[PDB]
Symmetry: D2
Subunit: 259 residues, 4 copies
């Protein structure tokens, strides 16, 4: 199959990448980063995320694989087992599995769109952060506090977890909204609890006074001036992993957080 | 269609019941409380819970309709809209349920329970200490007051009070939540609520004391010689008769934010 | 000084007690378990708690000391292997008294009053309670229960409920919620509440008057309760301390390492 | 007595100011900005915080009182309609001075800061990692969004939003909360808010980045090449002119639970 490899940039990753390419050359396997069928990410969850954002238009289409070295949540392979992976990919014993993604829409006074693998957060630019939270066109709460976080199911182990969020198995078709430091008084009454929305539900953040926000999708923070609305829904797009065995998710959670 | 109506027992619930029943006299709908097609519950979520459990062998046969003499989370009908409900008496919409299996160390067979809201586990007196096993792999040793496994529709009740996420009831899941964990040198728990898909099994295994207070919805039984309590999303679902799309998040707002 | 020793009853603690009693025979110190000036607890916080509850009518006149084998925890500053230093130091009188606040609970129906070293809890067994602060309605709580903690008790059950850990010198009590429903009909504050001396917190049933009330230790089923009242006790517990008590390092050693 | 008046700067508050200054002319009451003995704030806890900070070099000689021109918050015990009644009582001097504890922050690169509400530490943009040292002994290694040290009167503010306990402002203490700590068997923290007495010092020591966004109440400055941030209860207090018992828990009820008459 057509394949390509990204590496973190350090010595180890770059060497692994050249060795794996050399090993694929022995097989009916062509390198191609324009239209790849498999993407292999070497380094860690940062280089994986970068690869995901490199190929947002071809997600349909691509099966991702991660290598690195505490595996975390976007890898099931270590450098000392890469040769075994070349062979198994080789021909061809997997195993496609898909995780839900998150779509963010920002409207002004031209609409901008973003796909997240982990989460999207909103904060104030200037002073107070105050926002009306509208669910399916119906007002839910007037939030005042630090910010809000909408997470994918795979994203729930990251920022979402710090904020009091539920940890969700990544197969579940949903997105999850957590508060950052809500005032929660009688003027700005909020739910407190993390909220989990199914497919087709849209959450809308509507400014009450100040219309400037810091929005950050996965890695990247952007300042948005004169925002009329921010919209959240489960994306139509999914991310696909090439799986060679059942991904032991709850075991990873144990190994990461428990220990 | 065959039908029956349950009531809270108070003045208003019994009156509205006799009213609807007289309202079903004009049409080809016979009263039957042995094998009915529609169960109508009047009096709120406690009442609705009792009707669900009254007919849990015939869940594949029944559509439930809740009337709250008010609304809650299992009723979309007020006791003045009743007249327009009788006339209409639909799409059958399904909520996911929770299977609880209690396995014993003595010559007694496993007991299975279905929950619409939650199943909880606490000790019978002394400290509560249990090993949590997910898909046959030790996940944590929990010490604390107890544990709570919620259905998606149960997330608005006890689960919410414990720090759980609220989930739209259409989502195929169960959510595990902690009651007053201990975290110290010895005990380390995850802390966070955990949301499992269908086909996953969370197993509770005793460490020192085999006696547990296990609650299923309203009902809490003292269980002895317990060797394992097992949780999973049930293959069975409850069916609601929906005459309009249920505004779930609006109902969360009204109960909690208004 | 008149003094007495309690051990938990296992051999190791029983025989440290006997050998401390003999070591004290060499000085001007008299074994007296009716009116002691020094209570020594050997074996753990369970034993120290029982000692505190045995001598609560003379908290005025007693200084406490705890000895313990493992991680010393919050009510001991001595391990067995140091017992001979303590005997000498105590006997030469080389210590400073240090005090912790306590919690008074009053249960009305007739009237019952209780002192706590750690905490006092209220659970039902449909627990709806009106929470009244300094005679003013504060909230109507519905949930599993409520917990009022002393400063020293903040590392126990209070901690599991989301409460602040407080240094045991601060004159206060701390109220925490267990599983408040916190809706439209039963709005609660959520946060733990820290009260100074002379403030009074009153729990008043709205429907069912039966409650499981706990005071440290002892859970009592109180029948037909009209009111449970909390306030910082006028009484304090006194420790004989031979150096600065390293409270925050004990928090670390219990919870972090 | 010598007095001055700060307003939020909306017409409502600016006019109340001029009405009161005129009212005080019926008495022996001297308007003075440099050396006031009574600072009156008009327009909310934010306006009160600014006034405090204007006169933090002379806290022992000033008694503060607040009028809140919307509702009232936690620092204003007076409504705009009670202004004239307040003009009289102040002119008599029928008030007890009640003091609240303050928080001192020291930053070493030494700059020191007083807070009436809190002081927070966040990172520039990178991960926030700091060693937390209590009374010269390492307590935990914190990684997360930030840390917040509150005064007792500041517990009703940001501290509360972070899961902090609400404390009566008479209590001589400071309270430390976590902002979105990471707990993953590498960065284990206590989780619980911590309440320190007087004379205890909490020390934040950088690990692998020495640049921090430090906040003190309203004010937020980027400190570079920081070696240490130290917190402790200040020896300085703020004094309020009290004409009647401040009903703190009722104000907590009104703000956070409900207010069925207003």
């Amino acid at each position: 199959m057509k394949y390509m490899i990204t590496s973190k940039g350090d010595e180890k990753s770059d060497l692994l990448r050249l060795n794996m390419i050399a090993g694929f050359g022995e097989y009916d396997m062509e390198y191609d980063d324009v239209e790849p069928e498999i993407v292999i990410s070497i380094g860690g969850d940062g280089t994986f995320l970068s690869a995901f954002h490199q190929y947002e238009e071809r997600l349909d289409e691509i099966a991702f694989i991660g290598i690195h070295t505490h595996l975390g949540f976007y890898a099931d392979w270590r450098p000392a087992e890469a040769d075994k992976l070349v062979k198994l990919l080789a021909k061809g014993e997997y195993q496609k599995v898909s995780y839900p993604l998150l779509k963010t829409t920002v409207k002004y006074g031209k609409e901008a769109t973003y796909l997240a693998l982990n989460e999207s957060t909103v904060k104030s630019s200037g002073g107070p952060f105050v926002v009306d939270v509208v669910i399916n066109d119906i007002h839910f709460e007037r939030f005042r506090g630090d910010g809000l976080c909408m997470s994918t199911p795979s994203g729930t182990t990251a920022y979402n977890k710090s904020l009091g969020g539920a940890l969700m198995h990544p197969s579940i078709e949903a997105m999850q909204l957590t508060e950052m430091a809500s005032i929660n008084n009688r003027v700005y009454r909020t739910i407190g609890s993390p909220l989990v929305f199914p497919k087709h539900h849209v959450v809308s953040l509507q400014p009450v006074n100040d219309k400037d926000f810091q929005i950050s999708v996965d890695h990247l923070s952007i300042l948005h001036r004169d925002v009329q609305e921010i919209r959240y829904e489960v994306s139509a797009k999914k991310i696909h992993f090439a799986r060679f065995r059942s991904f032991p998710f709850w075991r990873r959670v144990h190994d990461s957080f428990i220990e």
